[PDB]
Every structure is written in C-alpha cells, then in structure tokens.
A paper describes a structure:
We also solved the [name] full-length (Dpy30FL) structure at a resolution of 2.13 Å. It contains two Dyp30 molecules in an asymmetric unit. Although we used the Dpy30FL sample for crystallization, only the C-terminal 55 residues (amino acids 45–99) were well defined in the structure. The C-terminal domains of two [name] monomers form a semi-circle hydrophobic groove, accommodating a helix with poorer electron density. We can only model a fragment of poly-alanine here without visible side chains based on the electron density map. We deduced that this fragment could be the [name] N-terminal domain because no other peptide was mixed with the protein during purification and crystallization. One N-terminal helix was bound in the hydrophobic groove of the neighboring Dpy30C dimer. However, it is noteworthy that the binding site is exactly the same as that observed for the Dpy30C dimer (CD) interacting with the Bre2DBM peptide. The molecular packing pattern of the Dpy30FL crystal indicates that [name] oligomerizes with weak stability. In the Dpy30FL structure, a Dpy30C dimer binds with one target peptide; thus, the packing pattern presents a hexamer model of [name] interacting with target helices at a ratio of 4:2.
Numbering used by the authors:
A (entry chain A), C (entry chain A): 45 to 102
B (entry chain B), D (entry chain B): 24 to 35, 44 to 102
C-alpha cells in the first residue's frame, strides 16, 4: 500500500512540487525580477490551485 | 566529465544577474534556498507541500536573499 | 543547511568563478593578447575585489 | 546534432590566432587549462576560489602555453 508518505524521496518530490517548480523556475528565468526568491514563492502560492493534489493524494 | 561546462557559449562586458546565462542566474538566486527547502520538505512530507515549500522560501528568504552578484 | 561546500558542482562554480570568468573571457576574446593564459589569470586577480564573496559566503 | 557547427559563417587567407572566430580562439588558448583548473577548483572548494583559480592558471601555464596555432 504505497502513498505519498511512503514514496522514495525523488518520487515524492516528482509527485508534489517538481511540476510547479519547473514552470515557476522557467517563468523566473524569463522575468529576472528584483526579488527572485519572493517572486518564486509568490508564483507557487498563486498557481498552487492548478497543481495541488494532482497526484496520489487525490 | 561533470566539471566540464561550456561557458564559451555564453561569452560569444560588465556581468550582472540580468546578463547571466539561465543556469548561472538560477544558481545565483534560488537554487541554494530551494535545495535546503526541498530537503526539509522531503523529510517532513506535510499535507500541503506546495504551500509548505512556498512558506519555507518566505520564512528563510532573509538568510538567502542578496547573497549573490548584486549586494 | 546548504553552503558553498555542499552545493552541486555547477552551482558551486556558478556561485564563485563563473561571473568573473565570463567577464574576463569576453575581455580576452576582444584583446587577443600575446599571453592569453597570463592575461586571464591577471584579469582574475585584478578584478577579484569586485566579484569576491558576492555569493553564499557573504 | 552537436558536431554540426557552421564555420561557413566565419569563412565568408592565412589563419592565425588573431583571425580565428571567438570560440575557436578561446578553445585554442584558455579552454584546456580552464577545464583542468575548474575541475581542480570544484574538487577542492577552497576559501578563495577566484584567487585559487588564478593561481592554478599561473602555476600550470607552462604546460599549456603556446600549445596552439602559434608555436
């Protein structure tokens, strides 16, 4: 009975944050804003709804 | 084999964050705090991982921001 | 707790020497001096102060 | 895919270091010793990396200098 808690580290990350990070990092590299960490963190929060629970968690 | 990375590509004067190649730009700005946050996230495995990672960035931004090519 | 010593190879180099090298290599390619290795090494030493510790080391 | 590089650009007679295209010039002069030095630097991770790399160049210049289109 595998779930998010039991997955290997890389699989866990690939299931949860890797897709939104890939998108966000690509946007960040294009924009190059004055506050990149804040920008990325903001990006995650703004776009969370489109990426959240699209994984084993269902 | 790994420490071989063509930067002769990007060079083909004054270098700042805006002019850095993509990988260098990211490595200068977010990769350190991301590496730390992703490690914390993988260990905790919280119910809201995207939110948690974003919170981690915000909470630890002060220790990582401006520690790069633009002081 | 990440620091310079713990960074992946490329991130380490990007944090420490890549920016000054980019600038120096561009100057070297423009000047084409009789002693290019010496010129580049000299460039690094002369401009070190403007690039040194502008990274995680702080 | 990678071994495809237009030099028909640069050709459009006697070739020396001064007339080489930028990438070729760098590859002829500093890329070898830089590749070696960057590898040594990444493995050691010293307190003064720019200084260390410059020192590496100076110390090993004799094994790399003039091993190119101009003997």
């Amino acid at each position: 009975k595998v779930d998010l808690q039991s997955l290997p580290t890389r699989a866990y990350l690939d299931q949860t944050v890797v897709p939104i990070l890939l998108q966000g990092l690509a946007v960040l590299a294009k924009e190059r804003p004055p506050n990149p960490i804040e920008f990325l963190a903001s990006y995650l929060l703004k776009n969370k709804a489109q990426f959240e629970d699209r994984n084993l968690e269902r």
